[PDB]
């Protein structure tokens, strides 16, 4: 028993991360088959990045000026193409630890692992969630670029998010492996704005059914009440508003606990009307909301991979 924050084991993607520099940008690109993907912003210098024309930059940029170096290898560059902000480099040689893979763009609210990485290099593995607002929570320095957001199924390795910039307000922006960025963001260095950061409701339930399977029960109240009388209240919180494929996807966490969703749901609110009187739930003194029931499940059966 006990419930933690978890990441996915990180090997399969150690394996893909290398160094990418363009005359003195260096940041992380992840080498996958013969490709390799980074920030298309690696063309631009400081000045660059106040006002960049990143197709007339590009230009400028021949195969050769992009060194891309796997350990003390450096790789030949054989090709090049933006893709939207990603830039990609075709290699000689695909990478012979390439793990079965897909790009795939994630949901506002659903969770993923960060490798983060400086020079090509793994410093560390934690778990985020794409917030409704579609900025991310990390821990990102200078050299962080290119490290990427991925979901493993037994041996595929499902790749969601590479990491572009911090914002004033030093959350984190960034784009699927398309180079589509997750919201309005923009690679360049003007001020932007995330939005409200509501809170994944569907989750914070989630987490509330991962305390009862692991004894911690104190909140369950003696309540009932309805969808629209629960959202009535989460919208006074800035909670996302639960709808029934929300209540649909927490079935398996009703079915094992004996609780009803809505059940739940009042157990919620009055946390929300009443805070937690200097009580924590496993181990937290505020609402969770950066597990997905898929997490909470996944952890509680013991899902492995390879």
């Not at 990491?163 to 003007?190: C, I, K, S, W």
């Not at 989750?203 to 991962?210: D, E, F, G, K, P």
Request: with cysteine; net charge negative.
């Amino acid at each position: 028993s006990g419930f933690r924050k978890m990441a996915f084991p990180s090997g399969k993607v150690e394996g893909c991360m290398v160094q990418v520099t363009c005359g003195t940008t260096t940041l992380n690109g992840l080498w996958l088959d013969d490709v390799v993907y980074c920030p298309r912003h690696v063309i631009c210098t400081s000045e660059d990045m106040l006002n960049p024309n990143y197709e007339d930059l590009l230009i400028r940029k021949s195969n050769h000026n992009f060194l891309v170096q796997a350990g003390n290898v450096q790789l030949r560059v054989i090709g090049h193409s933006m893709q939207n902000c990603v830039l990609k480099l075709k290699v000689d040689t695909a990478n012979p630890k390439t793990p079965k893979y897909k790009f795939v763009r994630i949901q506002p609210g659903q969770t993923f692992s960060v490798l983060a990485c400086y020079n090509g290099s793994p410093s560390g593995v934690y778990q985020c969630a794409m917030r409704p607002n579609f900025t991310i929570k990390g821990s990102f320095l200078n050299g962080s670029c290119g490290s990427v957001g991925f979901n493993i199924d037994y041996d595929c390795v499902s790749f969601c998010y590479m990491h572009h910039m911090e914002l004033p307000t030093g959350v984190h922006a960034g784009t699927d492996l398309e180079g589509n960025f997750y919201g309005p963001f923009v690679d360049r260095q003007t001020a932007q704005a995330a939005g409200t950061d509501t809170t994944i409701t569907v989750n914070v339930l989630a987490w509330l059914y991962a305390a009862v399977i692991n004894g911690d029960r104190w909140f369950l109240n003696r309540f009932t009440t309805t969808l629209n009388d629960f959202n009535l209240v989460a919208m006074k919180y800035n909670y996302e508003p639960l709808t029934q494929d929300h209540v649909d996807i927490l079935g398996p966490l009703s079915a094992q606990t004996g609780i009803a969703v809505l059940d739940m749901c009042a157990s919620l609110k009055e946390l929300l009307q009443n805070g937690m009187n200097g009580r924590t739930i496993l181990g937290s003194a505020l609402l969770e909301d950066e597990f997905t029931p898929f997490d909470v499940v996944r952890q509680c059966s013991g899902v492995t991979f390879q």
